[PDB]
Design a protein around this ligand. Structure first.
Ligand SMILES: [Zn+2]
Ligand SMILES: [Zn+2]
Ligand SMILES: [Zn+2]
Length: 178
């Protein structure tokens, strides 16, 4: 097993996956590492299994159809993993906790959003469709771009959104296009 957290790349109190070499802090893993279960398989393993049970799940899909799917167990897991993949980028630190807005010449967003909030929303099963989760994720970056305007700090929003969008296309097997 690895000696660092797959998500935050730090050592500490780690839980090890039984079916692959990754390890996690308790609250770095999404969902949080389960109290019992021997053996335990992490979310990367659980996602690989879904693909292996249904190879045709990797054929191209239309984003519009993916967004209308109901948050049944497998969609729920895919959204948890996609959220996890955003947290794996160190730049996610800017978007994790509740932001505040006091900058000359800007007004704060009408609907603030942040990754920990989305994490809680997923945990409490507040999303009924994939669309709900994806809208909140995209809102995070859109609020950032609008607030920071021409400051070069807007680029952090672009960078982290690209990570989200690439992983969204991979996980939900969106049809490749030019
Ligand atoms: Zn960690
Ligand atoms: Zn694993
Ligand atoms: Zn099948």
């Amino acid at each position: 097993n690895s000696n660092i957290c797959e998500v935050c790349n730090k050592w500490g109190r780690l839980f090890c996956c039984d079916t692959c070499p990754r390890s996690f802090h308790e609250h770095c893993h999404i969902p949080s590492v389960e109290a019992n279960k021997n053996p335990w398989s992490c979310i990367f393993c659980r996602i690989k299994t879904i693909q292996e049970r249904c190879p045709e799940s990797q054929s191209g899909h239309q984003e519009s159809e993916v967004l209308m799917r109901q948050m049944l167990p497998e969609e729920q897991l895919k959204c948890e993993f996609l959220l996890l993949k955003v947290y794996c980028d160190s730049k996610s630190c800017f978007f994790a906790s509740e932001p505040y807005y006091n900058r000359e010449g800007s007004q704060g967003p009408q609907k603030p959003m942040w990754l920990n909030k989305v994490k809680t929303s997923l945990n409490e099963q507040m999303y009924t469709r994939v669309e709900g989760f994806v809208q909140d994720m995209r809102l995070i970056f859109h609020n950032h771009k609008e607030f920071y305007r021409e400051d070069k700090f807007t680029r952090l929003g672009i960078q982290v959104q690209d990570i989200f969008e690439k992983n969204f296309r991979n996980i939900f097997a969106i049809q490749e296009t030019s």
